[PDB]
Amino acid sequence: RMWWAFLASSMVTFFGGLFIILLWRTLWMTSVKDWAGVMISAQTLTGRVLVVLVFALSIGALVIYFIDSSNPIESCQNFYKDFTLQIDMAFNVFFLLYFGLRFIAANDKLWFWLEVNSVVDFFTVPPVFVSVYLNRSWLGLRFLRALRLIQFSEILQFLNILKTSNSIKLVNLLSIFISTWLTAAGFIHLVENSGDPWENFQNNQALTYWECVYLLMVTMSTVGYGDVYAKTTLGRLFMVFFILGGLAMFASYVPEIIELIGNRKKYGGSYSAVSGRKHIVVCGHITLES
Amino acid sequence: LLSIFISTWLTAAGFIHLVENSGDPWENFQNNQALTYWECVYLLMVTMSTVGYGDVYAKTTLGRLFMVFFILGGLAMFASYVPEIIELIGNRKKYGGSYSAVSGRKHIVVCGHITLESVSNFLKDFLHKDRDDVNVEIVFLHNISPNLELEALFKRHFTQVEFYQGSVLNPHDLARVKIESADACLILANKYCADPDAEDASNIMRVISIKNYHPKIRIITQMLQYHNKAHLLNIPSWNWKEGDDAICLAELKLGFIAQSCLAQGLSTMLANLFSMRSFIKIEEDTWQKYYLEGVSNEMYTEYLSSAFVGLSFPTVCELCFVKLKLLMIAIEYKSANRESRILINPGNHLKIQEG
Amino acid sequence: MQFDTTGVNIPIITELVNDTNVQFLDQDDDDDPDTELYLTQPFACGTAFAVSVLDSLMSATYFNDNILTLIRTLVTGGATP
Amino acid sequence: ALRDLAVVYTLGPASFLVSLASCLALGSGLTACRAR
Numbered sequence: 002r003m004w005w006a007f008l009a010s011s012m013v014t015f016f017g018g019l020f021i022i023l024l025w026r027t028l029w030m031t032s033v034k035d036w037a038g039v040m041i042s043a044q045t046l047t048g049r050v051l052v053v054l055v056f057a058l059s060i061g062a063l064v065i066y067f068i069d070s071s072n073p074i075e076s077c078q079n080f081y082k083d084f085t086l087q088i089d090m091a092f093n094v095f096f097l098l099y100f101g102l103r104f105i106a107a108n109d110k111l112w113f114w115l116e117v118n119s120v121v122d123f124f125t126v127p128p129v130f131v132s133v134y135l136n137r138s139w140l141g142l143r144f145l146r147a148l149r150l151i152q153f154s155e156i157l158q159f160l161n162i163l164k165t166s167n168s169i170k171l172v173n174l175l176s177i178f179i180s181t182w183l184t185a186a187g188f189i190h191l192v193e194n195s196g197d198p199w200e201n202f203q204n205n206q207a208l209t210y211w212e213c214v215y216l217l218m219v220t221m222s223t224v225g226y227g228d229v230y231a232k233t234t235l236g237r238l239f240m241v242f243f244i245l246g247g248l249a250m251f252a253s254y255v256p257e258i259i260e261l262i263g264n265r266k267k268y269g270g271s272y273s274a275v276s277g278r279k280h281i282v283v284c285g286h287i288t289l290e291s
Numbered sequence: 292l293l294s295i296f297i298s299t300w301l302t303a304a305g306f307i308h309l310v311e312n313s314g315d316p317w318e319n320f321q322n323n324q325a326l327t328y329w330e331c332v333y334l335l336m337v338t339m340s341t342v343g344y345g346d347v348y349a350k351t352t353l354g355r356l357f358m359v360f361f362i363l364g365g366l367a368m369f370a371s372y373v374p375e376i377i378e379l380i381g382n383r384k385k386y387g388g389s390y391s392a393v394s395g396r397k398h399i400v401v402c403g404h405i406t407l408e409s410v411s412n413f414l415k416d417f418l419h420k421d422r423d424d425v426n427v428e429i430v431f432l433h434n435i436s437p438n439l440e441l442e443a444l445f446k447r448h449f450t451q452v453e454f455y456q457g458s459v460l461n462p463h464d465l466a467r468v469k470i471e472s473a474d475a476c477l478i479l480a481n482k483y484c485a486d487p488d489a490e491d492a493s494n495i496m497r498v499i500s501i502k503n504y505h506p507k508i509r510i511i512t513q514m515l516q517y518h519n520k521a522h523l524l525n526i527p528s529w530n531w532k533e534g535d536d537a538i539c540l541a542e543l544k545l546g547f548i549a550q551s552c553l554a555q556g557l558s559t560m561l562a563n564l565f566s567m568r569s570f571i572k573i574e575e576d577t578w579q580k581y582y583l584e585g586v587s588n589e590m591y592t593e594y595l596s597s598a599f600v601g602l603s604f605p606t607v608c609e610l611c612f613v614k615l616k617l618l619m620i621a622i623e624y625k626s627a628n629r630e631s632r633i634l635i636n637p638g639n640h641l642k643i644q645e646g
Numbered sequence: 647m648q649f650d651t652t653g654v655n656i657p658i659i660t661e662l663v664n665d666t667n668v669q670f671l672d673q674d675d676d677d678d679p680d681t682e683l684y685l686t687q688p689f690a691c692g693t694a695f696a697v698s699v700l701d702s703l704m705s706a707t708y709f710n711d712n713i714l715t716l717i718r719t720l721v722t723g724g725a726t727p
Numbered sequence: 728a729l730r731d732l733a734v735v736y737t738l739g740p741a742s743f744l745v746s747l748a749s750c751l752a753l754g755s756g757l758t759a760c761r762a763r
């Protein structure tokens with residue numbers, strides 16, 4: 002089990018590079034910076050098609066993760082034998098190029114280095130490079146690709162599917178809910194199937210990914226059947242943190258739910274004509290006495 | 292609040308751990324259940340969230356009694372602390388923040404009397420569909436929060452119109468809407484007020500504040516009474532030649548009415564001559580088709596070519612009408628004696644100068 | 647105004663309720679919008695009187711009660727009891 | 728062994744630097760062609 006290699010690749014890629022960026026901060030490029038910015042700009046048609054492409058390829062990568070979840074956590078495969086792994090790394094190197102375009106156009110290195118897309122790329126792409134180098138596949142943190150669903154609504158804004166603001170807000174809220182549901186299920190699946198590292202991985206509990214999705218849905222609704230649950234120590238700790246975070250997020254998002262429900266107009270609508278029944282319209286000063 | 296929550300969580304977990312591992316004293320301590328402290332913490336977290344997996348639970352009598360008391364006490368404490376949670380969440384300001392500048396997109400700051408009628412008319416004319424493609428955003432700065440109908444109207448144009456709560460007289464609010472980078476500031480007047488002089492003075496003071504923040508900005512203001520606009524000449528930064536304008540509602544309206552008294556229908560012609568009207572094709576032989584042929588016209592300004600120099604105005608107008616299919620109305624005669632003055636259809640004695 | 651040569655040299659004093667309006671009384675002021683009241687040109691030149699300074703005097707009266715008496719006998723013209 | 732461990736440590740960061748360098752070179756080339 003060489004999972005620490007795949008994990009530590011992403012860890013050094015994030016932390017050491019962030020540290021050297023801060024260190025350099027303590028100690029013609031405008032043209033290419035503006036070129037990259039206008040290339041990845043939302044208003045540019047190239048930006049539109051590129052964000053649609055990266056969203057679609059993220060969905061494809063998530064589907065590949067769903068297919069590969071049935072396989073064991075840590076296995077071995079060949080680049081030349083398996084076409085799916087080649088497709089996955091083609092997707093990942095495309096994400097790498099998009100990360101390059103985003104970084105060269107980044108106004109501030111720190112804030113671009115501490116956002117969701119940067120960290121998911123960091124925790125996704127070095128794992129597949131180590132996997133193709135050592136010819137060993139680890140499930141890893143590929144489920145984090147589901148976070149790309151958060152931008153789904155923006156795609157519907159570019160295709161003119163969504164026009165009203167309420168629809169955009171509703172789609173955004175649903176996308177956030179589904180994305181966090183799926184990534185929590187992925188964390189639970191990984192931690193339960195891998196087992197506790199300090200007990201020689203003898204705590205493994207054979208749970209499918211969909212069973213983890215079911216467990217998360219039962220937990221977040223505060224039902225708690227107990228038919229399926231977390232038996233590992235780290236899994237239980239993650240469940241505690243997920244319960245606390247879910248309650249906090251729901252409490253924070255209650256006002257937006259109230260706004261989406263809104264105050265319905267009680268006396269709106271129009272009169273519905275009934276055949277054979279005349280009607281008289283009364284207007285003016287309408288009070289109790291008259 | 293967090294410290295109290297964590298402290299009571301840990302001490303309840305400690306009580307459960309002690310009572311479960313010790314066992315029931317009256318049964319010779321044969322009810323002991325081997326639970327770690329962290330498992331008791333997990334059990335308390337599952338219980339207080341009302342999930343209740345049942346994988347780990349209290350089997351001893353005293354442990355179950357403690358669990359019942361902890362459930363009751365936790366519900367009571369949470370019910371008592373709900374108001375503090377609501378206070379910590381609070382009521383977020385909906386129209387706070389600041390305008391975020393977008394490169395290549397100018398913005399216009401609109402202030403003054405912001406209600407349904409004025410904003411509706413201004414957005415109807417400004418954001419007309421037949422308008423040529425302009426990348427201009429509109430920022431309405433107003434202290435009074437919008438009502439439901441205004442909120443709906445802003446939602447219909449959420450992609451081009453933003454609203455912010457604040458006052459022009461406060462320099463910080465001017466800094467929030469990026470008034471130093473705005474293309475123009477438009478001040479609307481309250482046409483229905485008890486004292487027009489007070490509204491005029493308020494608008495003049497808003498102009499003074501805006502020009503104090505940034506003297507080079509272009510301001511278009513609405514003035515109710517005609518005798519008040521002279522106050523705008525007292526501001527040193529008010530440059531009429533640079534595009535600062537005051538639109539007098541009473542003067543323009545009564546002048547339109549008087550010119551219609553001299554010749555009826557002139558007010559309609561003028562109103563249709565500077566307004567963006569959508570064109571509809573009419574094939575039936577009605578008056579609407581002949582009217583709509585004339586609605587489509589607009590005013591434009593252009594520098595005459597050097598070929599027209601030295602020629603009388605009637606000759607140039609005839610050449611423009613017959614050949615260029617253009618109707619020339621007026622010319623801006625510039626003289627060093629009396630600056631520049633617009634001449635409406637001058638006689639044949641006048642000759643076109645250079646530029 | 648203009649005379650026959652201009653009204654910018656006429657000495658005037660303007661009572662003000664809000665302090666932040668004082669910068670509106672001066673034309674050729676390079677003062678930033680966040681400049682405090684006592685550093686603005688109209689206040690420093692004595693051409694504007696902000697009433698809020700009286701709200702300061704109360705505090706100055708608390709730490710020393712002779713200051714108000716000195717101000718009263720210097721300002722009001724000698725109003726004996 | 729330590730060589731393979733060094734490779735699995737540095738393969739990610741090196742690939743990121745290669746990506747950034749390639750993007751910068753492509754942008755510089757396209758800007759130079761645009762200025763032409």
Ligand SMILES: [K+]
Nearest residue numbers: 563566586588
């Ligand atoms: K027209």
